[PDB]
Amino acid sequence: VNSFSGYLKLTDNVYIKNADIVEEAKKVKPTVVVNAANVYLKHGGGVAGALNKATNNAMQVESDDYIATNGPLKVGGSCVLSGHNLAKHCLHVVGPNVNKGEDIQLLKSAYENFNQHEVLLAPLLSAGIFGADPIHSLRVCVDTVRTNVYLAVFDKNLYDKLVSSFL
């Protein structure tokens, strides 16, 4: 038993809810919140901009130190950093950005990072300003992630479409 509320169950291990991941994170304090990061951990907009804003820019400060030490992530890769006031940990995962021409096949590799964590609150990778089809992203999520994932979908219209077209 865990503290996530109001989710619709899609499969044995995947759940979904129309929710703001920031507000969801502040209420649940999950062990892991997933950030839709880029390789530079520059959290300017979308989910990342919103998560970083909610941390009063502490996420960005920590991220800049991480990059200065380690260099950029790979597309499809991830790193674990602090969750600040939102979660114990933040798993920064880089899905491909279609608006940069990145290979959509790397989306499966991106979701594989979730399997290193028993439970996660997360957005749909490569959705929103990353330019992928969220229905495709949901399909890859369900077919790749084996751990328990609680997907927060900000847009109500998109949430209803995801539920209604889901196979």
Ligand X SMILES: O=C(Nc1ccc(C(=O)NCc2c(C(=O)O)[nH]c3ccccc23)cc1)NC1CC1
Let me know: does 90 contact 35? Beta carbons within 8 Å: yes
**The one-letter amino acid at 63:** S
Let me know: does 22 contact 51? Beta carbons within 8 Å: yes
By CB under 6 A, the count of residues binding ligand X is 16
User: Which range of residues in 20-28, 59-67, 101-109, 140-148 is near ligand X by CB under 6 A?
Assistant: 20-28
Residue 69 or 76 having the CB closest to ligand X: 76
Does position 22 interact with ligand X (CB under 6 A)? The reply is yes
Does position 141 interact with ligand X (CB under 6 A)? The reply is no
Q: Which of 153, 133, 131, 121 is nearest to 35 (CA)?
A: 121
Rounded CA gap, 101 and 24, in Å? 31
HSE-CB at 87 with a 13 A cutoff on CA atoms is 27
Using CB under 6 A, pick the residue from 46, 76, 83, 96 that binds ligand X: 46
Does position 19 interact with ligand X (CB under 6 A)? The reply is no
Does position 120 interact with ligand X (CB under 6 A)? The reply is no
Note the residues at the interface with ligand X (CB under 6 A).
Answer: 20-22, 36, 46-47, 50, 123-124, 127-130, 134, 153-154
